[PDB]
Amino acid sequence: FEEFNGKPDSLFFTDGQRRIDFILVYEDESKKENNKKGTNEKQKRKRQAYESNLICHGLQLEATRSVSDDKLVFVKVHAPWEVLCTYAEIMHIKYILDRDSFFNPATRSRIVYFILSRVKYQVMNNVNKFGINRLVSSGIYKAAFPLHDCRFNYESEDISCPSERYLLYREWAHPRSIYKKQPLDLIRKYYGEKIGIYFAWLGYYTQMLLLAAVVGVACFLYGYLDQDNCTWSKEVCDPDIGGQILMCPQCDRLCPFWRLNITCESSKKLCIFDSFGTLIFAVFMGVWVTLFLEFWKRRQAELEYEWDLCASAVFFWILLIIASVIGIIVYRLSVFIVFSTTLLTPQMATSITASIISFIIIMILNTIYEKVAIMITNFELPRTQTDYENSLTMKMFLFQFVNYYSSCFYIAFFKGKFVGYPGDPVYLLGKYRSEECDPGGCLLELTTQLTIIMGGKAIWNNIQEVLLPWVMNLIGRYKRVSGSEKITPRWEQDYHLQPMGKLGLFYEYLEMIIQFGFVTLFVASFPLAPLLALVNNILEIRVDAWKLTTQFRRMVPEKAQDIGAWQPIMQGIAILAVVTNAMIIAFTSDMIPRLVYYWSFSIPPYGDHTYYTMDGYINNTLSVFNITDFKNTDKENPYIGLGNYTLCRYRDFRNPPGHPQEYKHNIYYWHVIAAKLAFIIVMEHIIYSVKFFISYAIPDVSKITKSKI
Amino acid sequence: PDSLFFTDGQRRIDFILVYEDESKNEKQKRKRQAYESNLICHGLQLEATRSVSDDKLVFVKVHAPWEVLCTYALDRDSFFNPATRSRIVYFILSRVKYGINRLVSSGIYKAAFPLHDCRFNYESEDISCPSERYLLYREWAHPRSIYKKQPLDLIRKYYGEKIGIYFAWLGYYTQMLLLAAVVGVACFLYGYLDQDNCTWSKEVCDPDIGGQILMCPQCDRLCPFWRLNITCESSKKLCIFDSFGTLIFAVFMGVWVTLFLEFWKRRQAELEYEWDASAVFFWILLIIASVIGIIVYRLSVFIVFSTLTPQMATSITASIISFIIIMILNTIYEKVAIMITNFELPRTQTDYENSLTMKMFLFQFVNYYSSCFYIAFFKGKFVGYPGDPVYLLGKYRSEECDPGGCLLELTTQLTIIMGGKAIWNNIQEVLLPWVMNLKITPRWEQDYHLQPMGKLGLFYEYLEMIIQFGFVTLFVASFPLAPLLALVNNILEIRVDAWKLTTQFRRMVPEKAQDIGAWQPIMQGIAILAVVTNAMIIAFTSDMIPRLVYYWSFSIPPYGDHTYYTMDGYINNTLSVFNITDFKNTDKENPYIGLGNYTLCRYRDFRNPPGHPQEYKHNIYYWHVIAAKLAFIIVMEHIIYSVKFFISYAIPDVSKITKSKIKRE
Ligand SMILES: O=C(Nc1ccc([N+](=O)[O-])cc1Cl)c1cc(Cl)ccc1O
Ligand SMILES: *[C@@H]1O[C@H](CO)[C@@H](O)[C@H](O)[C@H]1NC(C)=O
Ligand SMILES: *[C@@H]1O[C@H](CO)[C@@H](O)[C@H](O)[C@H]1NC(C)=O
Ligand SMILES: *[C@@H]1O[C@H](CO)[C@@H](O)[C@H](O)[C@H]1NC(C)=O
Ligand SMILES: [Ca+2]
Ligand SMILES: [Ca+2]
Ligand SMILES: [Ca+2]
């Protein structure tokens, strides 16, 4: 029941003394009512009842019609001394100058939101209805939000106003300040503890990632600068050793005989990514995770001081299993179709294309999995909102984990690991030939599937992050092409911003946790992952700040001293990382066979060399299969007509033709597997013991906090 | 006349202050005068009574006027319990400084203690007396009440919360040991009924197999070629403790530990809700203690041997000597731990207790388990072929086990140590009078005639219980009957501890505690170590993996001759061969020379035979077995840990009733 005063950036009522805390917006009742008048009148009486109750509770309200549309009506709110102080006393809110000194607008909005949520408006049939969500869900209220100080780009016209949003845009947001340390105190003052904790966690995470990236770059540099000493690569590239070894066709009819020379580039890359530096980096990451968690616990203190039925479970657990089942299948089919369409290196282009296709399908399935998780959680009746979001966390994390990680787990553990000798190929259930890796293995394949997935996730998420709000706002503006182009107040143009749905930072935390999973689980195959994480986080801080400050309405401040249900997830991933890295190094990498050959099979008893040497590894490790020993009566003529050669070599430790044991696993195979298992056990035990010692030694609480009290 | 109260006066005792008069130098008289004047002026009543037995030993009592005690903090004396009154008065006395403990230590007071209600043997003469002590003794302490339930509430009301929680923990441990023991005996019986189907033991007794296998001197110079069939009775005994029943029992104990921890946490939660530098030096001592234990065990077995029935008697006597020397070393270990923790000078008493208990537990742990760990893992696991035996130090040969293994005699050592310790300790504390069985003075004088605990009795009881738990959970694969032994031990321990506390020990000041103490972390550490210890025990100490590998792989035409899977020929197709002409690659003195026409012998190892290109080298079977062992360890550890975590997550840790109370309250 008021008109626009004339000042566009006003943060006060028309009088200029009462501060606006919340804006209530609803559609005018004079519109062209359709369907039934009953619903319109009921929602009406509900809105007058709620407003009358709010005024009775002691809140001043003023409204004014929209300057552009005749139907939009905005209703304002205010909280004087008495009610504010009374509610501060009631809710245990823990040198007074003025209103804008000790009751900051964030706390004022929090108190007003509490009052508006706790107020009742109507009781019928002896049932009590209350909660602001019901008003919006029933269509009574279009929205309800507080106001920003001013525009992000230009300073506030009010001289008294601090224009905090301008400071956030200049210093914190905007890529101009890509280097300055973010002012977490200002974030807490302006957005609340929920945002400040998230951004402090992001900053600390990216710092620890910088440390990890420095160490990983050191290890990668050690691997790269030491190349001429990687003897097996020289043997593979040598046309007198590698070129004379006739590898054995991997598939049945689409594969000719091939020589081991062609894989020289892949051998060099493996030498880079399969050195002892990678093992040292895995060992270091083992303690790095513990240091990260413990020092985050310490920071989580200074920050608290400084800033005060099972049917749906089994079903959802079965929805995560079928998701994993379809992920592996889609990866395999993408690889197969890319290979069939095959006409720098052709084996580097095929891998890149297959990984790109798989990443595209995973990104497509992400949204479907999100919707399925929402549907499953809604079926269950949450006890409270906290349990709702906790269940959503536990389901979405598993779904996302099973996506990309079931994508990589296959390459690591079930790619060419249970395939027999050519005489008796292993078929899963018929004509399902089990493909196997090159003599080098699928370490490089996994490293390529991992880097493409990480980069694609980062880039696509960031582009979606900054664009979807932008395009939404642009089209919303396009809906009012009428040439108004005039001065307008703050509230109506804040209503044009996005609502910033109830989930909040759920998606940001989810993406950061998935990135943590990539960087911590498979670090035994890609030491450069922490650098990717560092770059991604450096961009993400500014991306999130910009999107929150420019293309989203002001969240009602809520406060929490912990990030939430993600911390148990971080602990679980920390526990699983050691096992995953141990298995990766044991099986996905050929380090253990190389060490075994160097120490026990390059000597006169086994090899022919006087002293330990790494020479002869390739020739003495590869096996032999006779062409005419192909069993099975079906498909006798895959390639028997060629007859160009007679013996083919394959990547497996089996006895040669002749011998009492034709093609059974030999002593070398059992030595290698025993060494692998001993390595796994020793690494796991040492890493866990060191982690326990480090956790026990550190006080787990800040020293200065103890000093002050 | 055995009166609890003042002479012809209504006032209830809380403590007694005794001293010896200087009449039988005057510094003690002046100290006593100053202390008495300060106490009297402080606002507490006192009365002096000369001991009937000796006039020199003058006893002085105190009281607690209600106004003073209330100010410092149906009937007036029924609102507070006597235990609470005694605790309040003790706190008041501690708050004053001349430190009652300092006066006691400096001779100012001979003792300071509260009083019991009445004699345990006879009921209180006073009809008004509740006679709580007599009823408590008859129904809970005397062994005739062994099978009655434990009145926890009464016990806490009389003594305090510490005693109540200790006894509740002991009772619940016994209750869970009931299930552990029934499952263990079920597994043992299952193994026992399968003696006839134990193929390899029957092969060992079968002379056509056992007697035709000439083993090579297991010892040095002495022990000439010994046939194998002489130990098939030992093999028969071993076949019971080496069956799948032990594996099943270990798997079951893996989850039983989790149940014990989780439900014990629920018990704690319910009880809490219902009621209102020099470190390197210590580690060196630990290392030397472990080495000393190993050395003494080795020397004991050496002296026993160098002098069915023979080997069993030698093992038993070696176990007794090891147990005796361990018990002897225990006193020195306690003394040194106390001294070294005293040199640290902790500021308070709680930190002193924690430091003492951690070091005490570590010393006991090494002293008791060093022999077991050596005889399980480091015995007969790195001795090479007889041609080049391993002398790691020089002239100190490493002993080796029989073809079956050292598991049976490891179980002998465990059974001897556990049982001997318990029985010995029991009799030492208080079981002499009962077997042997099978004027008037005031109450304060009677209590003064008695002796107190010493501030470490509860710590010792907890220590012995934790060591028993360690024996039960760590080496459970070897000895599945350990839980039954623990069950009986605790069944007697509850009653014996109650009896000694109620009869031979002075009344203690009550205290509260929110948990048993620093012992729970010991329990989680013990469980985490026990899982891996059992994994390695089953993998290495027991020959269950070699025989499974033989059954599944080497009874098949590619490596064997049997038409289908079977254990036939395991003994003869697993033992290695040694040629005497290769006596010593070192060209040194050999004992094999001569001794008849014998030219070859067999030994416990999976090496290649003479004449093979890689003769006397580990063969394919050895590597197969090692891979199987490592894989079994990995699988067992991972599955056990996953199951434990799943159970921990599944259990909400609450009775589901706390939420109802929250809603109502
Ligand atoms: O990600 C890869 N390489 C890479 C990534 C980053 C840097 N760098 O210096 O920033 C340098 C390199 Cl060679 C990569 C490596 C291999 Cl073997 C195969 C495919 C790849 O796509
Ligand atoms: C072991 O076998 C030999 C001959 O085969 C024999 O005479 C001896 O009595 C056997 N041992 C036992 C305990 O029967
Ligand atoms: C037992 O093993 C030896 C090892 O060469 C073999 O000669 C002998 O034949 C085996 N026993 C039987 C009954 O064949
Ligand atoms: C043991 O080695 C000597 C070395 O010449 C050989 O003569 C003898 O035959 C071997 N023993 C057997 C049982 O073959
Ligand atoms: Ca992102
Ligand atoms: Ca005892
Ligand atoms: Ca639990």
DSSP A319-345: HHHHHHHHHHHHHHHHHHHHHHH----
**Are A36 and A128 within one domain?**
yes
Whether residues B627 and A674 touch (CB distance < 8 A) is answered with yes
The answer to whether residue A43 is domain-embedded is yes
Residue ending a domain, choose from B113, B145, B180: B113
Whether residues B623 and A677 touch (CB distance < 8 A) is answered with no
The residue with tokens 């029933």 is A138
For chain B, the first-to-last Cα distance in angstroms comes to 51
**Are A132 and A219 within one domain?**
no
Q: Which of A579, A664, A670 sits opposite B627 (nearest CB)?
A: A670
**Are A387 and A521 within one domain?**
yes
- Is B461 among the annotated ligand-binding positions? yes
Q: Show the domain range for A578.
A: 181-486+493-553+562-593+680-702
Sign of the Cα torsion B108, B111, B113, B115 reads: negative
Distance B214 CA to ligand 2 centre (A): 12
**Are A210 and A130 within one domain?**
no
The answer to whether residue A463 is domain-embedded is yes
Q: Which residues in chain B touch residue A674, judged by CB atoms under 8 angstroms apart?
A: 623, 626-627, 630
Structure letter (DSSP) for residue B398: P
Distance B581 CA to ligand 4 centre (A): 6
Count CB-CB contacts under 10 A for residue B664. Answer: 6
Mutation target vs B (from A576, A653, A655, A667; most B CBs, 10 A cutoff): A667
Q: Is B529 exposed, middle or buried (0-12, 13-18, 19+ CB in 10 A)?
A: middle
Cα separations in angstroms, B123 against A275, A535, B16, B138, B149: 83, 83, 22, 10, 22
For chain A, the first-to-last Cα distance in angstroms comes to 55
CA of A667: which chain B residue's CA is closest? B620
The answer to whether residue A152 is domain-embedded is no
Phi and psi at residue A71, in whole multiples of 5°?
-95, -35
The answer to whether residue B24 is domain-embedded is yes
Cα(A271)–Cα(A226) distance, rounded to whole angstroms?
9
The answer to whether residue A708 is domain-embedded is no
- DSSP per-residue string spanning A591-627: HHHHHHIIIIISSTTTSS-SS---TTHHHHHS--EEG
Task: Report strand pairing: A63-65 vs A72-76.
Answer: antiparallel
Nearest residue to A87 via CA among A128, A129, A116:
A116
Task: Report strand pairing: A625-626 vs B111-113.
Answer: unpaired
**Are A124 and A190 within one domain?**
no
The answer to whether residue A150 is domain-embedded is no
**Cross-strand partners of B75:** none
The answer to whether residue B158 is domain-embedded is no
Sign of the Cα torsion B89, B91, B95, B98 reads: positive
Experimental resolution (Å): 3.1
Largest CA distance in chain A: 103
Phi and psi at residue A626, in whole multiples of 5°?
-75, 145
Residue ending a domain, choose from B59, B86, B113: B113
Mapped onto helix, strand or coil, the DSSP state of residue A90 is helix
Cα(B444)–Cα(B115) distance, rounded to whole angstroms?
7
Count CB-CB contacts under 10 A for residue A156. Answer: 19
The answer to whether residue A8 is domain-embedded is no
Q: Which residues in chain A touch residue B626, judged by CB atoms under 8 angstroms apart?
A: 670, 674
Residue ending a domain, choose from B66, B91, B113: B113
A453 Cα to chain B: minimum distance (Å): 29
Task: Report strand pairing: A120-124 vs A625-626.
Answer: unpaired
CB pairs under 8 A, 24+ apart, for A532-537?
A532/A451, A532/A454, A532/A455, A532/A458, A533/A206, A533/A209, A533/A212, A533/A213, A534/A206, A534/A209, A534/A210, A534/A213, A536/A454, A536/A458, A537/A202, A537/A205, A537/A206, A537/A209, A537/A512
Alpha helices by DSSP H, listed for B381-456, are 407-430, 432-437, 443-449
Whether residues A681 and B634 touch (CB distance < 8 A) is answered with yes
Phi and psi at residue A700, in whole multiples of 5°?
70, 10
Method: cryo-EM
Whether residues B626 and A681 touch (CB distance < 8 A) is answered with no
Mapped onto helix, strand or coil, the DSSP state of residue A399 is helix
Nearest residue to B603 via CA among B214, B205, B202, B233:
B214
Q: Please report which helix (H) or strand (E) contains residue B16, including its range.
A: strand B16-20
Phi and psi at residue B381, in whole multiples of 5°?
-130, -5
Cα(B454)–Cα(A232) distance, rounded to whole angstroms?
71
Distance B258 CA to ligand 6 centre (A): 26
In chain A, the number of structural domains is 2
Nearest residue to B531 via CA among B287, B271, B251:
B251
Residue type, B468: Q
- For residues A512 and A563, is the Cβ–Cβ distance under 8 A? no
- DSSP per-residue string spanning A12-36: B-TTSSSBP--EEEEE-TTS---S-
- For residues A500 and A253, is the Cβ–Cβ distance under 8 A? no
Count CB-CB contacts under 10 A for residue A541. Answer: 17
- For residues B486 and B93, is the Cβ–Cβ distance under 8 A? no
Ligand lying nearest the CA atom of residue B500: 6
